[PDB]
Design a protein around this ligand. Structure first.
Ligand SMILES: O=c1[nH]c(=O)c2nn[nH]c2[nH]1
Ligand SMILES: O=c1[nH]c(=O)c2nn[nH]c2[nH]1
Ligand SMILES: O=c1[nH]c(=O)c2nn[nH]c2[nH]1
Ligand SMILES: O=c1[nH]c(=O)c2nn[nH]c2[nH]1
Ligand code: NA
Ligand code: NA
Ligand code: NA
Ligand code: NA
Ligand SMILES: [Xe]
Ligand SMILES: [Xe]
Ligand SMILES: [Xe]
Ligand SMILES: [Xe]
Ligand SMILES: [Xe]
Ligand SMILES: [Xe]
Ligand SMILES: [Xe]
Ligand SMILES: [Xe]
Lengths: 295, 295, 295, 295
């Protein structure tokens, strides 16, 4: 037998950083969860019990805190590239670093219409994420994403004209609820190294904001023919607005809300045009994915 | 042996209701999770296998949907009182109904600065809850609450002057992070029945909004001497603003963020006045509770 | 305003202890999660910012580890009583301690039919719990429990003869699946103090084992007329076997498995006597409770 | 823009099936959670709102229940291959089916030393899983796995001789706790179609059992030099015992238990050879992966 692939590192490293403006007294906080996995010439730790090749996962954890102390942590695409580059440059035998970052929301509170200098609220479990793969001699590959964005529209969603055969019971509809949790990922063109990533720094926050805005607007305004058709419209617009993105992927659950027929009880009308009370279904759920690129 | 207490019913009943304004085309959604447990003369179902006394939990579920179809579901204090009253009035042998409601957030989206007529976003897992106990001949007891409100302040929290003995290692501090998940409950004076609850309907939403506002403002503005001292200030203000509340209870975790000493690495300074990077701790956590009433 | 009630302390304190037999080389591990909340003359920490009355929650955490170092941690009823007594005896102004312990399973592995001296497996998320309330001048109140015991029987459960009215759609049945997660609590007679708790030490493990055995046997053997009727039989037997128990409480979800009518597809028969494939329902669920005591 | 990849289907489909032996009266239950995602000529549903190409996800759900009614559901490798083959054979324009199955444990109860005919217990959240990819003209690729197997050993684990530099604080050790949650996957050689899968049916359960046995024995008996070294020994043995497996992958968290220095309190000794009480750490955790194949 032989080692075909191996990677190891530290997962679930929680980090908080605060920035204090001495002039204004305004403080800004960042909180993330980080995972770093390394690859390289490490097979002998598996096959020969040779620990000399192992950068201890405890040391990886230390390195994350040290790097956060000495560098900006925003945008996360920059921080992840700095962190990944460190490992491949510092250790001769490590040839790839894989960095995943989840950014948690701490939104500045408004108290009496004014932004508070040092108090924050977690407004939703929506996350902004990055996956950064730093590979020695092959540059830096970055995938950025938003996830946990949960939305619902109460009308202007349809689903009719699908295949009907002996396995089909679903009725065609011209008016239904549509609800999903959005997971959207945009993949950047490959970067040659940290200098190139630094030159594009302003594009990271702007593209995140655009992806979010396009997602919300298209969801709210599209008279949706299916999840498939609506998500394609979102991905098309994002690609049109940022030339440095190569692909956009969406992964969308279809979270079903079922009509409840109440006619058995005193002829009460609660279906079709009379539907007011619905039963949200915890499971099963549709799951629809698509990756859109440039033609 | 003998039955000392018994209650039974349906838990985890998810309900969605939509309201459609025909004039404006504006739609508003409500989504809740409901639990109803009944008590009364039901001992024989336990001791004698006498099912004749059991209102099936499946029937309780039906009743929830029917009641939501025929009545407003907001404010939840009103809906819960209607639902509880139904069971004690309809069934001679049922003498108490216990209704718990969790309200989930569906906040209307703003698209291009305008409120959208039928699209919504889940902005945070914060909940608004009610517990309604309807007891035949003893009226209606309502506890209202907010929970899952997660906040953090990066300075203006202190903790010094606590008891020090041979079990104490904690250092006194004049500047720390304070972060918690707020659970706050206000208990209404007892109501004689549904007519009285209906007469106070406008106070329910207003008091929820006040409790929330007071919580956020006090948290952000108090130069906090301890969780204990700050939470007391919150409860005191809520009681001052709503005479129909008898008690306010807060239950607050103290979610610790620890300094990381980096001086072992090239004398890097990251403690006290130089602290920028911190380690959020998942566990253990302080837990501080208090119930404040009128003197 | 005035403080009507207050308690504070440390929650989610994870503790592991190992015992090593020097003779046999056999090691035994215990792992728990502990919460300690204190009450007493502490109102001024809330009303006056007087921290002098506060035993820091960090110190409570230290005390848990120290107590675990110097005392047995099994049975958990004994450990919790030791821990609670410590706080009310050590601090003049603290008059009650409330200790909750969750014990996690680490079951010794069998390798080639022999018990391994130092390797363990987590066989199920079933827990053994205690709640110990130590109140100065009123002794020690202990509630012991098992929870997270998930069982299912595929036949020999019935449910017929329940109340039928205009809210009822549920069909009577003489053969259904019954599945639940068992939460069972037995409350001990009040103990005068630690000496009395120590005198009953052998009864704690034996009663836990009896409660578990009775639960499983009765579930498997009862031709069940309802959850209500079966759970009563369990509680009755436990009370008969241990005179020092005052009450037994069960809290049982009814986790529904629904028939799926497939007759729309080529007349396929999958209901009643022909039912083979079922749809487990995540929600809603019945919830049935009862507290049984001595007559 | 263009669709580069697309797949869609139904996730979280819970299924229960019971088998009844008429002779013995013995019943056996199976419970699974299933996900089916389809690929093929479906781009136009995304780009042109052409629903005619969509097999509704609701119909996929129906098909799962129908297939479970008409076929054995065990071993899951066989069931998944049947289900995947159905979709690519039934629909001309669907060319790949991806089936994921999670099998939940329902272990027959022993009551008074005898196996009960129809009562079951969930002994642990350990799962047996399959991923089946059925691709038209390319056969059937099956990955089998076990996951959620949580183990701990209290001694006979070491970790010394790792790289030490200016980022390293971790002390070398010759005696530590080792605890992990095992995720192990074995990938079968490609099968030409359903006939070939059926010819190997007895190997599926036997190989699962071998993978489990090897994992537990090696964990318990290896005087472990690192997670890396121990996991390699496991994978090597599995490959030696089943020639039809091409690769074995393990993914293992290192769940840390930290010593607690208590010497600040009355010189209490709780480190090194005197360590008895430890603090389990919820996060961060090491994460170690390896894929082993044949040389
Ligand atoms: O938008 C939808 N897309 C689908 O593929 C589907 N299948 N059922 N309902 C559905 N809705
Ligand atoms: O605000 C606090 N209250 C407390 O009781 C405490 N104990 N440790 N840190 C603390 N902080
Ligand atoms: O055992 C049961 N008890 C109940 O109270 C009930 N209500 N519906 N089904 C039920 N089953
Ligand atoms: O077994 C281990 N492997 C590792 O790579 C490691 N790093 N720190 N501790 C460790 N333990
Ligand atoms: Na390198
Ligand atoms: Na009544
Ligand atoms: Na005392
Ligand atoms: Na096909
Ligand atoms: Xe951070
Ligand atoms: Xe969508
Ligand atoms: Xe609702
Ligand atoms: Xe607070
Ligand atoms: Xe312990
Ligand atoms: Xe039961
Ligand atoms: Xe199944
Ligand atoms: Xe391991």
């Amino acid at each position: 037998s032989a080692v075909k692939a191996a990677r190891y590192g530290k997962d679930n490293v929680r980090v908080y950083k605060v920035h204090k403006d001495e002039k204004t007294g305004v403080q800004t906080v960042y909180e993330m969860t980080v995972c770093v996995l390394l690859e390289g010439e490490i097979e002998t730790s598996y096959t020969k019990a040779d620990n000399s090749v192992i950068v201890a996962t405890d040391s990886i954890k230390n390195t994350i805190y040290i790097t956060a102390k000495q560098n900006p942590v925003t945008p996360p695409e920059l921080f992840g590239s700095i962190l990944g580059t460190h490992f491949i440059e510092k250790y001769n035998h490590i040839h790839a670093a894989h960095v995943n970052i989840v950014c948690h929301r701490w939104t500045r509170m408004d108290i009496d219409g004014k932004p508070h200098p040092h108090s924050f609220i977690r407004d939703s479990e929506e996350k902004r994420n990055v996956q950064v793969d730093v590979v020695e001699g092959k540059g830096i590959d970055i995938k950025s994403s938003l996830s946990g964005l949960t939305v619902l529209k109460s009308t202007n969603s349809q689903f009719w004209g699908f295949l009907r055969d002996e396995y089909t019971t679903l009725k065609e509809t011209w008016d239904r609820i549509l609800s999903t949790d959005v997971d959207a990922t945009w993949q950047w063109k490959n970067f040659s190294g940290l200098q190139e990533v630094r030159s594009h720094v302003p594009k990271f926050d702007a593209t995140w904001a655009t992806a979010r805005e396009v997602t919300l607007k298209t969801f709210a305004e599209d008279n949706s023919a299916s999840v498939q058709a609506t998500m394609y419209k979102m991905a098309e617009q994002i690609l049109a607005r940022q030339q440095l993105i190569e692909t956009v992927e969406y992964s969308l659950p279809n979270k079903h809300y079922f009509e409840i027929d109440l006619s058995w009880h005193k002829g009460l009308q609660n279906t079709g045009k009379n539907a007011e009370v619905f039963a949200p279904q915890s499971d099963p759920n549709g799951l629809i994915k698509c990756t859109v690129g440039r033609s």
